[PDB]
């Protein structure tokens, strides 16, 4: 349950949560390898 840790940020796979990048279980990355979901 972690989509980049917020609306849209980056995907450097934090070294204490590994939530970004890998993206939630179904978030789906986007143009930018950033984990987010506010439009496309």
């Amino acid at each position: 349950q972690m989509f980049c840790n917020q609306t849209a940020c980056p995907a450097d796979c934090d070294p204490n949560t590994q939530a970004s990048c890998e993206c939630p279980e179904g978030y789906i990355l986007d143009d930018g390898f950033i984990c987010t979901d506010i439009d496309e």
Side-chain angles (χ1 to χ4, degrees), residues 5-34:
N5 322 312
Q6 67 209 82
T7 9
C9 64
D12 244 286
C13 309
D14 255 81
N16 282 283
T17 181
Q18 249 234 122
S20 89
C21 30
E22 47 267 342
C23 275
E25 265 119 281
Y27 220 53
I28 228 67
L29 258 171
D30 237 313
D31 54 324
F33 278 99
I34 296 317

